[PDB]
Amino acid sequence: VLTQPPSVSGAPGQRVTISCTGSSSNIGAGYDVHWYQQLPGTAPKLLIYGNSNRPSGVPDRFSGSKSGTSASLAITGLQAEDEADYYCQSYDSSLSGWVFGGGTKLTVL
Amino acid sequence: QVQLVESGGGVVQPGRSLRLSCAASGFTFSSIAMHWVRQAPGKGLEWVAVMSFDGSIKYYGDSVKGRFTISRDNSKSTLYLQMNSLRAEDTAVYYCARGVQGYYDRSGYYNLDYNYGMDVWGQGTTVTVSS
Amino acid sequence: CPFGEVFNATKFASVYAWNRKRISNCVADYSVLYNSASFSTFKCYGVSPTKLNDLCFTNVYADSFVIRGDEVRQIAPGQTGKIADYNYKLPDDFTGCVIAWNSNNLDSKVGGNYNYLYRLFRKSNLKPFERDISTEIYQAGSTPCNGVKGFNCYFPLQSYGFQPTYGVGYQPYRVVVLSFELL
Ligand SMILES: *[C@@H]1O[C@H](CO)[C@@H](O[C@@H]2O[C@H](CO)[C@@H](O)[C@H](O)[C@H]2NC(C)=O)[C@H](O)[C@H]1NC(C)=O
Numbered sequence: 001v002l003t004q005p006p007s008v009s010g011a012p013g014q015r016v017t018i019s020c021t022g023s024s025s026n027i028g029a030g031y032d033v034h035w036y037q038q039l040p041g042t043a044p045k046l047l048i049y050g051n052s053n054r055p056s057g058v059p060d061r062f063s064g065s066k067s068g069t070s071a072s073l074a075i076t077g078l079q080a081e082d083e084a085d086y087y088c089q090s091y092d093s094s095l096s097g098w099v100f101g102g103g104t105k106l107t108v109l
Numbered sequence: 110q111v112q113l114v115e116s117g118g119g120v121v122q123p124g125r126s127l128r129l130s131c132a133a134s135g136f137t138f139s140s141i142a143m144h145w146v147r148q149a150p151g152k153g154l155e156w157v158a159v160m161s162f163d164g165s166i167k168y169y170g171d172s173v174k175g176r177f178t179i180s181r182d183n184s185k186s187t188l189y190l191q192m193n194s195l196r197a198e199d200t201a202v203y204y205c206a207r208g209v210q211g212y213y214d215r216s217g218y219y220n221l222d223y224n225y226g227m228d229v230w231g232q233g234t235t236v237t238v239s240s
Numbered sequence: 241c242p243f244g245e246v247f248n249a250t251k252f253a254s255v256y257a258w259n260r261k262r263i264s265n266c267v268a269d270y271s272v273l274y275n276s277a278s279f280s281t282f283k284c285y286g287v288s289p290t291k292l293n294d295l296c297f298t299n300v301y302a303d304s305f306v307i308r309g310d311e312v313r314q315i316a317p318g319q320t321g322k323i324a325d326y327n328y329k330l331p332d333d334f335t336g337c338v339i340a341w342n343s344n345n346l347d348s349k350v351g352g353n354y355n356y357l358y359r360l361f362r363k364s365n366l367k368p369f370e371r372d373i374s375t376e377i378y379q380a381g382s383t384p385c386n387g388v389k390g391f392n393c394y395f396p397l398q399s400y401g402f403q404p405t406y407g408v409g410y411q412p413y414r415v416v417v418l419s420f421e422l423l
Contacts, residue, residue, distance in 0.1 A: 030315070032224045032310070033226055034225075034226035035309050036154075038153075038154075040126055043231060043232065044204075045230070045231035046226050046227065046230075049225060049313075049316070051222065051409060052308075052310040052409055053311065053321050054311070054322065055228075055316050055320045055321055056321065056325060056365065067407055085153065086381045087153055091222070091223065091224065093222075096222070097156055097168070097171065098144070098156040098159070099156065100146075100151075100153060100154045101153065102153055102154060103152065103154075136332075137332055137333065138410070140332075209316060209319075209327060210285070210317050210332075211283070212284075212285055212286070213282065213283045213284060215273075215274045215282045215284060215287050215290070216289075216290065225313065225316070225319075228318070
């Protein structure tokens with residue numbers, strides 16, 4: 001799958017990165033990675049698609065990147081609302097699957 | 110407004126099966142390619158199945174290939190996921206998520222080996238395989 | 241024949257006011273867009289390429305603008321966002337095509353190209369295919385603005401600033417969107 005840090009934490013008002021490492025047969029081959037914010041108890045909501053784009057509803061704090069074999073959902077100035085899980089999703093070509101990530105655990109301090 | 114309500118919840122035997130029913134209303138259902146994506150409780154999501162706007166192009170996940178099947182009915186605008194030989198590790202809660210309308214590749218070859226994400230997500234009906 | 245000027249223009253228009261350049265009743269060759277090796281994202285919906293030879297020279301439209309790199313996949317049907325519901329919205333039953341190519345060293349200034357603008361703030365997210373020109377101050381609920389550029393309320397446009405030191409997703413991609421129709 002797409003490896004992801006199991007637990008990262010941060011105080012309110014900081015900038016916390018969330019890495020998402022992949023191989024050359026996935027995200028590193030030229031397929032884009034997305035990001036979902038799954039609150040515990042509901043369905044995951046689409047946060048970033050195509051590494052930079054934010055739909056209508058998601059605020060201006062969630063910036064994504066993609067370079068080499070990585071990604072970074074940079075949350076700037078995190079409030080007391082966004083403490084959910086974050087999954088990065090590529091689509092690999094070795095097994096032609098839409099592979100997800102293991103899942104991070106972000107909690108405010 | 111759009112939503113993906115669904116039904117077909119499961120308390121079933123390890124080797125028998127059931128057929129899901131992921132309904133849809135509000136959006137143009139006949140043009141876009143729905144996905145099925147599950148989440149075993151305790152861990153994160155995992156991709157299961159995909160099918161196109163007609164029923165031609167279909168891919169599967171490596172734990173669920175060859176056993177499962179997926180079909181569309183554009184008279185009631187719903188999805189179905191049939192899961193013969195529901196063995197023990199195949200328990201989760203199952204979400205159906207709206208894909209995209211994509212078709213490209215300037216040689217006439219209509220295909221979707223795509224990049225995009227899954228926009229609007231279902232409610233999830235928990236399946237349970239237990240000895 | 242008539243779109244050798246649409247794909248070869250010396251300068252493209254910005255996204256916030258793009259051109260609706262309409263080709264007309266000549267014999268159109270779609271074997272010069274198909275079989276082009278130069279393109280990167282050739283995406284044509286329900287009317288397939290190399291099957292629209294014997295169809296539809298019925299005042300075909302051809303839009304043209306320039307967006308950044310990882311912005312070019314906000315242009316599909318649906319796909320809400322910031323440069324697809326304020327700037328350029330195309331409907332959910334879109335027919336024809338979207339063609340876009342990588343302008344590496346044709347639009348990028350080493351100081352920064354600061355005259356490619358995209359809209360940022362607009363109430364009532366934009367209807368399909370509708371073009372704006374009008375630049376007015378935003379009035380986000382607060383005290384009634386009158387040309388202020390103050391706190392919480394300011395200009396609705398924002399320049400891009402392309403540079404050759406960027407990655408792939410920031411260097412500009414000129415987008416040409418084709419659309420067909422009948423009587
Ligand atoms: C202006 O447009 C034409 C048509 O797209 C370009 O001509 C083609 O360019 C490619 C790459 O150079 C060639 O392989 C084709 O043989 C050309 N076709 C024609 C019509 O001869 C042209 O390159 C563009 N302008 C310039 C001079 O770059």
